[PDB]
Design a protein around this ligand. Sequence first.
Ligand SMILES: Nc1ncnc2c1ncn2[C@@H]1O[C@H](COP(=O)(O)OP(=O)(O)O)[C@@H](O)[C@H]1O
Ligand SMILES: [Ca+2]
Ligand SMILES: [Ca+2]
Length: 431
Amino acid sequence: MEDMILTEEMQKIMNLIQDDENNVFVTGKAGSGKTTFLKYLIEKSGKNCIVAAPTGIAAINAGGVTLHSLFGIPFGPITPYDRLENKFSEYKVELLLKMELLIIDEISMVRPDILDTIDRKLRWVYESDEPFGGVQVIMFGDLFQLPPVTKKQEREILSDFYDGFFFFNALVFKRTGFHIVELTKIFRQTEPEFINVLNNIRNYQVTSDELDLLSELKDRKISSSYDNEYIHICTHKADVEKINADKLGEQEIRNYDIVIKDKFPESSIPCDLHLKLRVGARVMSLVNDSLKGYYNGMLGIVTALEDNVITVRMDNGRTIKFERYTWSNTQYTLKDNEIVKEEIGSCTQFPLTLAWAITIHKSQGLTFDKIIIHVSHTFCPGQLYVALSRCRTLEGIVSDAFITKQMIIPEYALIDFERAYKSEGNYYGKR
Ligand SMILES: Nc1ncnc2c1ncn2[C@@H]1O[C@H](COP(=O)(O)OP(=O)(O)O)[C@@H](O)[C@H]1O
Ligand SMILES: [Ca+2]
Ligand SMILES: [Ca+2]
């Protein structure tokens, strides 16, 4: 990227990371430039960086590696007194010993014990008492997107040792801490009234006027149809697959298989395994290409299907000839005494997926012009905030049922964290 804007908030982060004793939590809503600024921070860093993330898909998109493979972490809850098989290769040890700056993306998807397992592993390899073995730690993510639901079993094992199931509850943050910088510029568009409604909801300050706006979002006619430009945002996987497949149909179906090359983790695959399409299918772009003119999350309609090209007319009116795309699975090594990346696998497939409907989970980090919210009549803190936040404006939202005050379920663990650091020098943990 070459026309990137350097905001005062981004420079504040760069100012902070100069002092290599400073850890930093970089946060902000979808569209506030976290992924782009991450890349900038990489390039403009005089330090051997490693980028890691808690899922393969997020690792791949950030150009990094999973936390579990980087540090050899067993899958499952781990107390501070569960003993680790600290078996690392001589190369992994040498690599970790050259890491000066660890960057964790999607920090809010990191279950807290994993940070502590990481702190322990680094202390063992550095033979030090300093948290994370003295390595500087930068963390990127939206504080207000919930992590994976805690499985009934992890719940029981871990509650004896932790106060909460958010990343800042890691025990290491009694021994170290971090500055917080929220990115507040939304580059795609700037919408005060909508942004203020989202914030009022997440802070449980909804005014009676705002409660009335939510009521007017209901529209049975629009929300029960599938031929408009609205995308159905639903919580459950089954509902989205039902809607997408129902609309796809069985007549004149074209199939495109994923091509795997060398070593690629199944759960890191960010595309369809068997992309099935037809002329007129509603689809979403999965990757960004500024020169070709599409971005991750752009919606369009298939108009032509050939062997190696899928022609799509996007919502903005442009026709685009999509070709297959190759995601690279990389890992870090040492070239001399410098950390570099090396490809160990790839997968190849058209970067499009059916998009009459998308899950709340698959749409993490995306915004759309027009959404139909399916009210999750269950409950759980923060659901309605997440669903509303999938839109770019207030006027673009439609609901399948009336939105009532009781559907606003606040997450007080998060409100307390925000208000506590905002009044403690934008810093959390030990000084
Ligand atoms: N520094 C920047 N200057 C100009 N545009 C930006 C900048 N950062 C992000 N954008 C724009 O915002 C959109 C995506 O932002 P992104 O980096 O994905 O933010 P996030 O990860 O917070 O969702 C793109 O349209 C991109 O061009
Ligand atoms: Ca992002
Ligand atoms: Ca240090």
